[PDB]
A paper describes a structure:
Human DDX5 and its yeast ortholog Dbp2 are ATP-dependent RNA helicases that play a key role in normal cell processes, cancer development, and viral infection. Similar to other DEAD-box proteins, DDX5/Dbp2 is composed of two RecA-like domains that include 11 conserved motifs. Here, we report the first X-ray crystal structures of the Dbp2 helicase core alone and in complex with ADP at 3.22 Å and 3.05 Å resolutions, respectively.
The Dbp2 catalytic core bound with ADP (Dbp2-ADP) crystallized in space group P212121 with six molecules (aa 53–496) in the asymmetric unit, arranged in a D3 hexamer. When Dbp2 bound to ADP, the two RecA-like domains underwent a large conformational change, distance between the centers of mass of the RecA1-RecA2 domains was reduced to 30.8 Å and the RecA2 domain rotated by 143.9°. Small-angle X-ray scattering (SAXS) analysis showed that Dbp2-ADP is monomeric in solution and the observed hexamer form is probably due to crystal packing. Although the conformation of the helicase core in the crystal structure of Dbp2-ADP was in a semi-closed state, it was in a completely open state in solution. Simultaneously, we observed the interaction of ADP with the Q motif of the RecA1 domain in the Dbp2-ADP structure (blue box). Structural superposition showed that residues R495 and R496 occupy the ADP binding site, and ADP binding resulted in the CTE moving to the side of the RecA2 domain. In the crystal structure of Dbp2-ADP, residue Y221 of the RecA1 domain is close to residues G392 and D393 of the RecA2 domain; therefore, the spatial distance is in favor of an interdomain disulfide bridge formation between the RecA1 and RecA2 domains. Interestingly, the addition of ADP changes the conformation of the helicase core from an open state to a nearly closed state, which is different from the ADP-bound structures of DDX19 (35), DDX21 (36) and Prp5 (34).
Numbering used by the authors:
A (entry chain F): 54 to 496
B (entry chain C): 52 to 496
C (entry chain A): 53 to 495
D (entry chain B): 53 to 496
The structure:
Amino acid sequence: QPQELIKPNWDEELPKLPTFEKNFYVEHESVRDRSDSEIAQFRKENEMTISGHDIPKPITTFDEAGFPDYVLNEVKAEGFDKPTGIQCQGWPMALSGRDMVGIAATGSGKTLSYCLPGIVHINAQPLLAPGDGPIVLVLAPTRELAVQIQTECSKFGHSSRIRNTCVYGGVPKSQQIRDLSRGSEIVIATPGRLIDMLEIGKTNLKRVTYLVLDEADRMLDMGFEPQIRKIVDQIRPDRQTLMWSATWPKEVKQLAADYLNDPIQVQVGSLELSASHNITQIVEVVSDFEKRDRLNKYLETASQDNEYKTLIFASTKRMCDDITKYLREDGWPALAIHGDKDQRERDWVLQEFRNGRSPIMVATDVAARGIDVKGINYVINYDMPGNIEDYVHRIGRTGRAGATGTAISFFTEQNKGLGAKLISIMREANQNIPPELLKYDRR
Amino acid sequence: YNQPQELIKPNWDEELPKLPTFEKNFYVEHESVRDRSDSEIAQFRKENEMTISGHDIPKPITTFDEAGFPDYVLNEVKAEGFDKPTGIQCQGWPMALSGRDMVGIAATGSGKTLSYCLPGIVHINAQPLLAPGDGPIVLVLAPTRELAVQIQTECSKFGHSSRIRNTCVYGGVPKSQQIRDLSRGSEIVIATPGRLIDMLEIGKTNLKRVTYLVLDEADRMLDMGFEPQIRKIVDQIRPDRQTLMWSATWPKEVKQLAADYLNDPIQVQVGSLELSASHNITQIVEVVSDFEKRDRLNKYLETASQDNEYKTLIFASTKRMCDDITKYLREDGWPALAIHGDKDQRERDWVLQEFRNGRSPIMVATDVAARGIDVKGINYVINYDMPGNIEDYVHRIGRTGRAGATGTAISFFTEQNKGLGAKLISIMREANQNIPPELLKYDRR
Amino acid sequence: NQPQELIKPNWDEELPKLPTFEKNFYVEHESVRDRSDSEIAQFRKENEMTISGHDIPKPITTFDEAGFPDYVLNEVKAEGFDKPTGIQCQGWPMALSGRDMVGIAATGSGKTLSYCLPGIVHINAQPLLAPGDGPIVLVLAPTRELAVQIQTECSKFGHSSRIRNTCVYGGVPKSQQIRDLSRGSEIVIATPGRLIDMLEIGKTNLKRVTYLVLDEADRMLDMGFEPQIRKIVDQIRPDRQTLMWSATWPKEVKQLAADYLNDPIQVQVGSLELSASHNITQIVEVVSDFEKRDRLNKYLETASQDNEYKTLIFASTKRMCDDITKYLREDGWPALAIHGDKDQRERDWVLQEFRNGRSPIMVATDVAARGIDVKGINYVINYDMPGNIEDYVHRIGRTGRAGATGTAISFFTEQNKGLGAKLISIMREANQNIPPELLKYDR
Amino acid sequence: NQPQELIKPNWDEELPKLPTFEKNFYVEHESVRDRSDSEIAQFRKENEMTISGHDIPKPITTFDEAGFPDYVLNEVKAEGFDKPTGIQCQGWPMALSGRDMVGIAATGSGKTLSYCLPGIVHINAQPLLAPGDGPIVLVLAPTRELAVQIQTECSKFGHSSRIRNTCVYGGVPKSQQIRDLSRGSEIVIATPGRLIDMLEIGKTNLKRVTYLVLDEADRMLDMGFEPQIRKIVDQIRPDRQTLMWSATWPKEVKQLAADYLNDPIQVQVGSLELSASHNITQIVEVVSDFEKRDRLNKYLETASQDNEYKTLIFASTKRMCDDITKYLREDGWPALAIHGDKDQRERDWVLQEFRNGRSPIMVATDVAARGIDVKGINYVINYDMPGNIEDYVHRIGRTGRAGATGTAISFFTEQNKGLGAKLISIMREANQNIPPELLKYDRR
Ligand SMILES: Nc1ncnc2c1ncn2[C@@H]1O[C@H](COP(=O)(O)OP(=O)(O)O)[C@@H](O)[C@H]1O
Ligand SMILES: Nc1ncnc2c1ncn2[C@@H]1O[C@H](COP(=O)(O)OP(=O)(O)O)[C@@H](O)[C@H]1O
Ligand SMILES: Nc1ncnc2c1ncn2[C@@H]1O[C@H](COP(=O)(O)OP(=O)(O)O)[C@@H](O)[C@H]1O
Ligand SMILES: Nc1ncnc2c1ncn2[C@@H]1O[C@H](COP(=O)(O)OP(=O)(O)O)[C@@H](O)[C@H]1O
Ligand SMILES: [Mg+2]
Ligand SMILES: [Mg+2]
């Protein structure tokens, strides 16, 4: 805050900055030749379609990607195989130095599609020369989703000794300045918390050559574009930008044309959320004050069965700090999982929820990602997500074998933008729709 | 928070049947180890000069794939790029992964740290989840702040696959931030005995899940009077745990301690006091230095500054005195860079980059920080502090004068390390020694 | 610094430099004198009274028969109290007469206010406090949880006559405890440990103390408080009025009464016997402090099998009562707590949720659970053990009223050796079986 | 560096390795010799001199008569006083010649400037401080409030030849004591208690101390500081020049001189005694700590009845003098205070408001109320008592010079029993009535 705004004149300062390389792709032995026929059948096998110039070719296995061995032995240490559809096509795009757009399901590997090409980008550049800022900068919509990607970059950047900082709201900055002063090759920042440390000048965006935007759709819902364009005007314009999000409305396409240089977009996601038919959806029009009483009403209704197993969902981590701080004081056993928690800390909470030691657990969307806890009654959406991909995945946590379940959601008028497609999720699963939810179905 | 006290010493003869069950042995003698048979091993022992004395000691490994390590950890030594594991790790791993109490003595250029860190992770993953309010399962004890964090930097690089969390708790610093990391749970704790007891008295940790205890550098740790505090820490750990001792000096106190805390121990020694002792460096250690140390250093740098471009290497034993030495001379107008273990994980390679590029002729470093560097071309290596053994001294001075066949070594010796005066002349008198007018006191019997 | 820490005054020549005060304020009423010598004779015998002294007054029968002014009488009026306790029926006119007295009764019948109401009329008879003068009333309690309740009830009758009271006690920072003494206070309820300290640091003086109270004398002698008390009364004028109060009458309490009281008049009211009703199964486990949470989790899962259990965990202090309920909520258990320092009226919302099965588990202290007939209690768990057995009997006494069945699981440690002799003495009176591990601690 | 430290250094082997300083700078301007040998003899006991030594120099008459440079002499002129004190008339040639010397005089004599000015010329012969070097001049003082009096008194003659001076003393947070020592100072003012606490943390060093002074070594010896200075004087070069100063001549002060001074030379300037010129009604009251606030209030109602009363309260510490000042102000009594740390010139504005009767009550410390003519004051209450009986005689001495009447209310506690023995003989010689309760602390 105390003094800075000035935007630099990059027409004048680009000849003053050092030179960097962005293209690294290796076009490994196997891919060519196949050739140009079985890729087509493989492409739209896993929902791939191309629209761009000089398309690279998809990969099949990890070892066919031009990743070095210090990062390739970490995919092995993490036990994965068969990289995700976007990782099979997005990586040859990213290692070629191209600006690109990537949309896929939230739960797919959009994160590692830019995290791994960012490590090769860093290690090709000289040492950090203290007082130099980061080389990779990724901007995220919310505080605790920045930490999920920051726990995903620490999994593959120890080999290269890469230092990483995460800058986000809601916390004292006196700890993040002492992580930035030690140097950090990757910085994960929220636009609100990042600018006011560039205005006090404890970091620079002068070495940022590889910029990536995770979940740009969510980014637009908080009015953060006045804050991102202000700092993207503080970076060298010849960097490589990588867009990533889950949806494809008209507003992400507007943002792509303003920052990307000849962008290439990857589409893997696809409408046909099936809304597995064995879940009763009850959506209720409520307000800010009306909850915490409907929850007691639906918790004591769940309490009558034994042993019930309830899962409450929130979209922030401090709404889970609020809900849990309220159930426990009313006399309800409650456990929580959010992003600022540690996996092994979150894995003990997941273990105690399966053996039925406490029937209630509050969770966030990022924490409740790829979990199989069978036995779940009464999944409660105390909040509603920003998209219809998380809703189906939120309620998708009920009923595989027994083939029955209920999902209690608390809906309010500031969530109507998804109602129109929400009824079509209830309408395909042949669920009853309340007359007060038809208020959010027109045009 | 605040609480000042507790003391409890438990009666383990009565509390053992109430404790859960755990496994310590895991190692399975992979293909090429068996069998040879006992003809190949015979001189590979003295090829790697390792000395075993116990009963039913397992047989050494040669490959990484020959250790009973899973692939999720074996794919991490690959990402670190290591081949041909260290000699002591080639025999210490079959011993330690087999759940036996052991002591290992070798020079601090070996893999002593990872010879017990890697077997400790499989020990962790064989136990249930941490069940909050449970303390660590592995406890490693270190003498000082900056040795513990090197232990933490080798456990951090190998715990992502298993998501193992590790904390390091050490004295001389406000307690306010390590308590918030202990509460989130940590499977491995690396502690100095000085503060470790100081967190059991106000109670943010327990030693009741500790099944795999390690004592690193027990010789130097014993030299600072930490044993009266180690009595308190081992009296609160299950007596049936697995203890693994490691040190460099092989006294004359371990033999006592090893047989007071280890149950049926197995010792392996790889090092030997007989090698190198490089004669191509003029070693000039004569300065009493009690508190002169800064005054001679400017004068010994004023003589070094005359040549150009000189390249000087200052050595310290602690980080808090290694951030100091740079803090003392830079204010007199001397270009200095600092290198230690606590900070500067990636930063020390930039300082080493500016030491090769000739950007600053002076660099202060500690023994843990100056590990495996070939930055040679270094005149006038100064031991402003002195190490605990005669193998760190030789490696301190050993980084000068190989090709050009000349070098100098200035050390500052004082009564606070007189226990090593006897051993340095044994290398100095082989080294065509100087006159000890001030070591006179420190050679007899 | 806070030095020099004992100085004994010379009362023999500095007492003639201190102001004069009066101790006798009672004026016998029309219906009290006389009846006579038969109605007061029997009335002491139908209330188990036993007097011993010189010039013992006639006991009271109703509130207005006591020589109380009207501004304190209209306080018991608004409090809606019926037919004051026997110890109040005779304890009042003895205290109002300026006489040193001893009152023996069960912990809770009338003892606290037996000296508070006569202590207030003692206060309003003196000039204002002239800031930098200490208190007129000095109350000594052994523990923080007991000293708070004295202040919690002295603050209930000291607002008509504007009156301030303070608690000073160990384990807590003293900075705030001095900023209330900075305001001056007529009454102080003090722990010997923290009282000796603030006198050595010169943040209060005992020069205005003329009316001394020693509550829970049997506790203080069990905790080695006499050598600290002997130093406290070294700084009080010898013509003070000292009032002793206790629950038992061993040889060390009545030696302490003879050493400090001038012509004391004893009154014994209670029954002195602990019958330990036999329809509760008393299970005692000799454990240490690090097993207590594991076995609580295992005894709670045993109660969890019932439908529906209602357990009461017991702690002695506020700090662990906060620990226990902190730890249960993180283990997945529904937990409520009630203690004295906090929870004056919010304490009663907890009792209201615990009676109705809103929450099956409630943690409490011994003082906080005083006089609650919350029937429905199975499995009262003594996570702590008190210093005295009268509280144990009342702790376990909360299990089985009509159905006449219950369980009590106690956690016994080496630190509780002082009560083992009296713990088994009642466990065999109730003819419950004793496990061998606490036979070490008999006699 | 925060271990324990100050193990004795080996000076027979470490002294040849330090740079060198010379101590002799006195020039003995020419006509000081000769007079001679009888007109010096008349000079000696006009000022009550007592000399015992070898090769004794001759004393001074005027400021111009000393072998002082001009940069130091232009300030003795700037204060506007002539004719330095009898102890300054010989103490300067003793100290400026670099010989170990002890001077005894009353506390209030010119004992101070006999060491301040010869210490600065000793500095100016040496190079700049070369940060990380400790001080050259070290003087030891017994009390915080006496240590600040000399460092506020060193701030008068060391500005021109720029010399920085710091005061380090116990009972206060050390975080500001190290940050002025970080500035470096040729003169540092230290209490034995807080000096060892800065040598063990290694934020000052005693390697360059060449000019040691022991001011008021008598009172320092009574507080058990001797085992601590032998700890301190063994951490400094043995070839230094030491300067002792005190008012009393016990057997322990001279055995203290033979143990630390090398070939010491002795001078006294005063025919001792304090005979408590008698004009004050002394009412001693054997009291304890918790009643004194009410006891002073009753003595204030007794003074407040008079008009216009003017009372002076005395304390020994600054911190217990701010307590007294804003403790009766809570009782409704207007009080003003004077101490050594603070109130540089407002010490003088409160003094002007005290005589003209804008405020009748004033609390004071010992050093802050020394050498003031504030007469018109009755009712001086010694709420605290000093460590010796020489300050108290002056403390009560503020009551009655012309009018020939005065009162002195003293508060005595077993915290002051060390002074009870001689308190009675001063009251018995002033033939004041003696309370029965104070006779407890007199003999054996
Ligand atoms: N090929 C793969 N095999 C197994 N797990 C994977 C693979 N790719 C990613 N993951 C896991 O999925 C998660 C990554 O999800 P993320 O990419 O953040 O979702 P989004 O698509 O919203 O970015 C991480 O937990 C990662 O470990
Ligand atoms: N597989 C390996 N091959 C070769 N060197 C290794 C290997 N693993 C670790 N090292 C090196 O050996 C050292 C391991 O630390 P170590 O020397 O055991 O600490 P200490 O010996 O003081 O206990 C480090 O310097 C590290 O670079
Ligand atoms: N006359 C009365 N009528 C009804 N309740 C009373 C009366 N006197 C005291 N009480 C109750 O008894 C308690 C007073 O303290 P008490 O329990 O008597 O301590 P002790 O048991 O040590 O005497 C209060 O909780 C109050 O509600
Ligand atoms: N030559 C002088 N002329 C006038 N005043 C002096 C002279 N020397 C010292 N003083 C005064 O004496 C005080 C110095 O303290 P001092 O009284 O010497 O303490 P001590 O009694 O311990 O010697 C200063 O306040 C100063 O004003
Ligand atoms: Mg080691
Ligand atoms: Mg009571």
